[PDB]
Amino acid sequence: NKPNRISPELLATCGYFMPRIFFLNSQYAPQVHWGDVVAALSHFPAGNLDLSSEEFWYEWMINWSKVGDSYINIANSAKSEVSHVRALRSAAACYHWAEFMYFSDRSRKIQLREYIRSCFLSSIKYSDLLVDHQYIVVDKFHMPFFLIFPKGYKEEENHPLPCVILSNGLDSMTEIEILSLAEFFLGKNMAVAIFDGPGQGINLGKSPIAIDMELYVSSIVKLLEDDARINSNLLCFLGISFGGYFALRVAQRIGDKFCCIVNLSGGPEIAEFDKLPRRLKEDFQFAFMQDNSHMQSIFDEIKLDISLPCKTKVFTVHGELDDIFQIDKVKKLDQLWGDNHQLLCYESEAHVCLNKINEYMIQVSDWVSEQFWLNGY
Amino acid sequence: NKPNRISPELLATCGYFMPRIFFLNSQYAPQVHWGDVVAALSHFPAGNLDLSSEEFWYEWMINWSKVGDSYINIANSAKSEVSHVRALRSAAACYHWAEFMYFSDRSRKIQLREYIRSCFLSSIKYSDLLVDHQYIVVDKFHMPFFLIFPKGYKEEENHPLPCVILSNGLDSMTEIEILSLAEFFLGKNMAVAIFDGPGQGINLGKSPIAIDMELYVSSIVKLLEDDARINSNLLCFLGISFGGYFALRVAQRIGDKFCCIVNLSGGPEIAEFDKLPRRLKEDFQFAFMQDNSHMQSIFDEIKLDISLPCKTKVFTVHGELDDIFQIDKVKKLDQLWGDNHQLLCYESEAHVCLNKINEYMIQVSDWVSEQFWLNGY
Ligand SMILES: O=C(O)/C=C/c1ccccc1
Ligand SMILES: O=C(O)/C=C/c1ccccc1
Ligand code: NA
Ligand code: NA
Ligand code: NA
Ligand code: NA
């Protein structure tokens, strides 16, 4: 017998995704260990290496699901609350990597996201974070919403807190990548607001993603204005990937509600749909609940009028080699938006600059603090 | 330009070490991100792949040192205490992977361990852990010692706490792997005691490692008996790798001082020195401050008399494919020590079973709690 190991061929093929799978070293957000990746991939079938192929992501979903199941079994037999929660967190992370690039069975994908959300909701009662979970009603839409307070938060010991609203992108899960990002703000005694807009979080595959996500963000801003615990004059909006595109829309439409806005590798338009790499065509199709033939028209509608002014301070982090949001379009926006837009461009980074996420989230979190301080915090 | 990535050849070669480098997802202990591994290895020279070769580990030390330096630069310009500490933690992790398998410049290795310890000591004042740091005098030896209390610990709100003493192995660093393990006990409202015996932690390359480490453990037990905050009737000793060998010695010599002992992949004797794989010959030589020709005689001295009774409950986690502490010798000890020794053996795992460390540390931490409960906690 040889020790369980990942094939070199498979590690190479997955290089783009490894920084995403490991993501940020977090306190609360679910995260894989190296051995979870070995459990998922050590017996992955050989000769299955096409990231654009349906067959690759089916086997990926099956193998990551097995690892999630193993952690649920640990959770169910756990002898302590602390062990139970650590196992639920590990399960949630594994089920997310099972589902995030799997689009072929809508019911299975929704089921995996329900497993993740059940892991999160089960874990809240044991958390040392205060989580205020509710639905925000936006016309007929009941929007899952989480307002999370820093460790050791007591309303009577605090002035009203600054708050960062963070948006999902196309294929993130709220309590995985977005809670991971949110910890950089919770760590600075800021409240955070994370949410499942249409086509986001547990709504992915249920409702189409809303291009006008700023409508839903406006409803969060109204809740935060009404909450005595939150200083609504000290708000930030952060989005990642397609959520960064939402950040640019928020900057244009309701920017005056925000001290500052962070765009983690969104852009004002998407590369040609037909030529998108990996599984991105099926990812966009799934989120918009549309077929291949309808998607370029949606991309045409998504494209921003960059002549429309941005109404607050924007910080964009972008990779020169981004193959979804091309750097040329981001640099054009940076030039046109002038002194109100700061661009951190990494020369040899792909989409979301994930080799640099620890360093750039340090810089981003301190930049947000600085903008609150500039607004009299 | 292509995105910064690790060579497939290099990822393959390093497969044994990747689970060790990523280790445990921690709250306090320094830990790398995937992008730190990319920063270290993306420009690693081609055709340098011999894990037994001095030239491999020189380039490894140089490249990881660059990543550590980059995080010190972030720490030094950090705009907040929280950002400063996260950067110091990242630097410490990187400097540890720079040094842990580098033996060719004693002064450089000691310097890197001093950087790590400076990162740790600098971080303590900002920690929400109470760290009581002192020297324990053992004859002429001044032993660095850290007694760490759980998050939110107040003596007046608590009965005297159980305490887990955790030992380094040959090439671990106290505040990296051992603090990572310790968090599983801190998370259960137990105190932990971590320490630099002779040839351990900042003493590696200064004093030879003590075979009779139980002498130093006895001095910790005396301090814990004297500390009103600690229930000295509720003590555990845990060791990892060569520290697990120390755990077996503690079980034999002072086991009656412990409710239970955990052996993470130590054994009662080491495989033949001359045939050790990778850089293990130079690792053992460095820790014992001896040349190649003296080391088999030291291995002969290390070998336990397994007929000497173990005086408490022992839990061993071991890999069938361990190439340092052979499973046959561990199974012989398990049989001879009978009902007082429990063995968790993973069929396809190498030394320390690092593909399983999250799951087995859940099980181990609950087993320790159970042993304290059996002793009336
Ligand atoms: O939600 C998306 O569409 C993408 C999010 C994301 C999050 C982390 C890394 C890369 C992409
Ligand atoms: O200190 C040693 O000799 C080895 C320790 C260790 C720690 C973590 C993983 C593998 C080995
Ligand atoms: Na358990
Ligand atoms: Na308010
Ligand atoms: Na900073
Ligand atoms: Na005591």
Instruction: Kindly give the distance from the C-alpha atom of residue A126 to the centroid of ligand 4, in angstroms, as a whole number.
Output: 27
- Surrounding residues of ion ligand 4, Cβ less than 5 A: A 227, 230, 232
Q: Can you tell me whether residue A136 is helix, strand or coil?
A: strand
Concatenate the DSSP letters of all residues of B239-301 into one string.
EETHHHHHHHHHHHHHGGG-SEEEEES--SS---GGG--TTHHHHHHHHHT--HHHHHHHHHH
What pairs with residue B263 in β-bridges?
Answer: B239, B316
Chain B residue numbers with beta carbons less than 8 Å from the beta carbon of A162 are none
Q: Which residues are CB-neighbours of B373 under 8 A, at least 6 positions away?
A: none
Around Cβ B154, how many Cβ atoms within 10 Å? 8
Best to test chain B binding among A7, A66, A72, A355 (most B CBs inside 10 Å): A355
Tokens of B109: 């290795």
- Would you call B65 an interface residue with chain A, using a CB distance cutoff of 8 Å? no
Cβ–Cβ below 8 Å for A8 and B12 = yes
- Would you call B26 an interface residue with chain A, using a CB distance cutoff of 8 Å? yes
Tokens of A39: 């459990």
Q: How far is CA B325 from CA B96, B192, B250, B363, in A?
A: 24, 26, 18, 22
Instruction: Kindly give the distance from the C-alpha atom of residue A59 to the centroid of ligand 5, in angstroms, as a whole number.
Output: 41
Q: Looking at ligand 1, which residue's alpha carbon is closest to its atom 2?
A: A169
Tokens of B4: 């910064």
Resolved by: X-ray
With CA atoms as reference, report the closest residue to A167 among A78, A114, A233, A241: A241
With CA atoms as reference, report the closest residue to B34 among A249, A216, A19: A19
Tokens of B116: 């790590």
- Which domains are present in chain B? 8-123 (1.20.1440), 128-374 (3.40.50.1820)
Q: Which residues are CB-neighbours of A234 under 8 A, at least 6 positions away?
A: A160, A161, A162, A163, A259, A372, A375, A377
Query: Residue A273 carries which DSSP code?
Result: G
Q: How far is CA A129 from its chain centroid? A: 20
Residue B374 CB burial class (10 angstroms; 0-12, 13-18, ≥19): exposed
Phi-psi category of B265—alpha, beta or left, where left has phi over 0 and alpha has psi -120 to 50? Answer: left
By the 8 A CB rule, do A333 and A221 touch? no
Q: How far is CA A141 from CA A198, A201, B329, in A?
A: 8, 14, 64
Amino acid type, B186: L
Number of H-type helices and E-type strands within chain A:
13, 8
What is the signed CA dihedral for A353, A357, A361, A362, rounded to 10 degrees? Answer: -120
Query: Residue A161 carries which DSSP code?
Result: E
- Surrounding residues of ion ligand 3, Cβ less than 5 A: A 78-79, 83; B 366
Q: How far is CA B92 from CA A169, B64, B97, B180, in A?
A: 33, 11, 9, 13
Q: Can you tell me whether residue A227 is helix, strand or coil?
A: coil
